[PDB]
Amino acid sequence: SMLDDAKARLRKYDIGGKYSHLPYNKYSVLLPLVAKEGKLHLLFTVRSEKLRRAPGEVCFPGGKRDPTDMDDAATALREAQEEVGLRPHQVEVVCCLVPCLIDTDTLITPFVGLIDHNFQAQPNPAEVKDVFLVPLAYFLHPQVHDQNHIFEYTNPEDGVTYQIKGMTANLAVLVAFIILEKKPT
Numbered sequence: 346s347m348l349d350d351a352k353a354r355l356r357k358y359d360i361g362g363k364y365s366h367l368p369y370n371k372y373s374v375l376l377p378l379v380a381k382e383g384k385l386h387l388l389f390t391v392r393s394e395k396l397r398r399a400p401g402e403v404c405f406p407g408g409k410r411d412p413t414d415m416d417d418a419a420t421a422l423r424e425a426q427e428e429v430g431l432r433p434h435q436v437e438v439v440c441c442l443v444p445c446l447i448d449t450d451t452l453i454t455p456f457v458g459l460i461d462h463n464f465q466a467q468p469n470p471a472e473v474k475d476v477f478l479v480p481l482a483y484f485l486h487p488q489v490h491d492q493n494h495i496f497e498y499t500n501p502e503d504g505v506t507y508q509i510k511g512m513t514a515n516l517a518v519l520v521a522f523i524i525l526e527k528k529p530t
């Protein structure tokens with residue numbers, strides 16, 4: 346199946362807990378895969394302007410680990426629930442991808458999760474100004490604009506254009522390569 350295939354691909358890139366104990370300022374993000382109209386999509390947020398970290402940016406759901414979190418995956422899930430209403434039972438965490446080192450003292454750990462088809466986003470306006478989907482295939486042939494490289498994605502449902510950049514754009518490309526490379530049509 347499309348989903349069994351995607352999960353099988355993703356598991357080959359799982360680093361698991363290999364980097365999880367290192368003494369960093371720790372953040373997790375959830376890369377949420379959603380199947381619609383027979384294709385995979387990634388779910389993104391636009392962060393509220395009110396935030397301290399990345400205000401107004403296109404980001405995956407996520408945030409800073411807190412003492413309650415059993416592990417780095419729990420961080421991702423807690424933060425996704427708080428931001429977009431995603432409950433734990435609505436997500437299957439498939440793997441942990443390469444972590445992203447920033448600012449010399451920070452480690453961001455990305456988790457890919459498959460999202461239940463009955464999930465409907467409920468954007469929390471204190472955290473998120475918008476929640477949107479991009480087809481995963483877009484990241485193989487993106488519309489690039491140079492400021493460094495920025496992707497522009499125009500939702501054909503409404504004509505709205507989103508700018509995706511930095512680590513968020515880099516992860517979206519990685520996931521697209523992992524899942525979509527070398528497939529029969």
Ligand SMILES: *CC(=O)NC1(c2ccc3c(c2)OCCO3)CCCC1
Nearest residue numbers: 372398399402403404405407408447
């Ligand atoms: C867009 C994005 O990834 N936002 C998050 C983020 C985490 C950590 C840092 C930054 C953004 O910005 C600068 C360095 O630290 C928000 C919370 C999870 C990811």
